[PDB]
């Protein structure tokens, strides 16, 4: 009779997987989006005799740090990181989140702001002169040429800090921004170094790594598993109902 619960669990948790895939799948064409891969965990129910039941709890082990594929836009300050690279960004609460969105923007007052909550590099938020005409180099240096000055005045105005971290040592933080896992904090510290070997691809953006192929069979298997759970539930309740005649008379 308690079998139904286990089956229920599976059904319920499968819906959660569906949910993940859906959010994983609507976010195609979202810049620099990291697909949230998902798994199902068996959960044994260690008890006093005959360990027979296991639950099907749903989980998201992390994000897929597979570089999405690049779109060439020729915009001077659209940035693409190399593999395992991250742009550091001052989060809403204030802490160094990490993103792959290189769609940098400038405000009227010269705040470099990957979609606002600005970008962090070599100091606080990067600031540039208001008539920016920004150019971003390969290693991260940012040079600015005021529009009405001779072009041999492109002296660098800042540097864009980049950080190397991937997969096991990075987790999403309830915003599009990633942080370290607090297991990679009794390690390379709270604030990472600049790692002067991560390169920048200028004029090119990165799209989401939402693999449609594995998502489509994610959904196919999810549907099939769900209706298998429904069959188990149906048989269990019919068993119990037809059983209930024992106690009468």
């Amino acid at each position: 009779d308690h079998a139904i619960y286990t089956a229920m669990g599976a059904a319920s948790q499968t819906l959660n997987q569906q949910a993940v895939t859906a959010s994983n799948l609507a976010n195609a064409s979202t810049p620099g989006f990291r697909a949230q891969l998902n798994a199902l965990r068996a959960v044994p129910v260690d008890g006093l005799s005959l360990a027979t039941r296991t639950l099907v709890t749903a989980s998201t082990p992390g994000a897929d740090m597979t570089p999405g594929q690049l779109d060439y836009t020729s915009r001077p300050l659209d940035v693409a990181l190399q593999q395992d690279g991250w742009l550091v960004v001052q989060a809403a609460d204030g802490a160094e989140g990490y993103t792959r969105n290189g769609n940098i923007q400038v405000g009227p007052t010269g705040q470099l702001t990957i979609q606002g909550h600005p970008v962090i590099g070599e100091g606080g938020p990067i600031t540039v002169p208001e008539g920016s005409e920004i150019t971003i180099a390969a290693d991260g240096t940012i040079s600015a040429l005021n529009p009405g000055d001779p072009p041999n005045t492109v002296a660098p105005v800042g540097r864009l800090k980049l950080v190397k971290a991937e997969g096991n040592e990075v987790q999403r933080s309830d915003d599009g921004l990633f942080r370290l896992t607090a297991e990679a904090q009794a390690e390379r510290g709270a604030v990472l170094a600049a790692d002067p070997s991560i390169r920048i691809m200028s004029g090119v953006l990165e799209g989401s790594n939402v693999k449609p192929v594995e998502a489509m069979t994610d959904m196919i298997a999810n549907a099939r598993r769900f209706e298998m759970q429904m069959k188990v539930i149906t048989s269990v309740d019919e068993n119990e109902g037809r059983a209930n005649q024992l106690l009468s008379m």
């Binding site: 139904i4 319920s12 539930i233 119990e240």
Partner: protein, 67 residues
């Protein structure tokens, strides 16, 4: 009591009742869990109804003690 599910959100910043960063708060119902809850509740209710009937039959045949 009141269930402590994380109170799922939706995003419709055209509907009122959506706060800053427009998010309609959308009650947190695990539909399949509630389906199964009703299913098992009916089954247990039926079991207890039967137990009532069986005990009454036991007692009415208790009255026929002797005669």
């Amino acid at each position: 009591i009141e269930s402590q599910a994380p109170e799922k959100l939706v995003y419709e910043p055209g509907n009122p009742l959506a706060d800053a960063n427009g998010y309609v708060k959308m009650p947190n119902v695990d539909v399949v869990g509630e389906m199964v809850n009703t299913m098992s509740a009916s089954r247990s209710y039926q079991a207890n109804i039967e137990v009532l009937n069986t005990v009454k039959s036991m007692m009415l045949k208790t009255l026929t003690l002797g005669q």
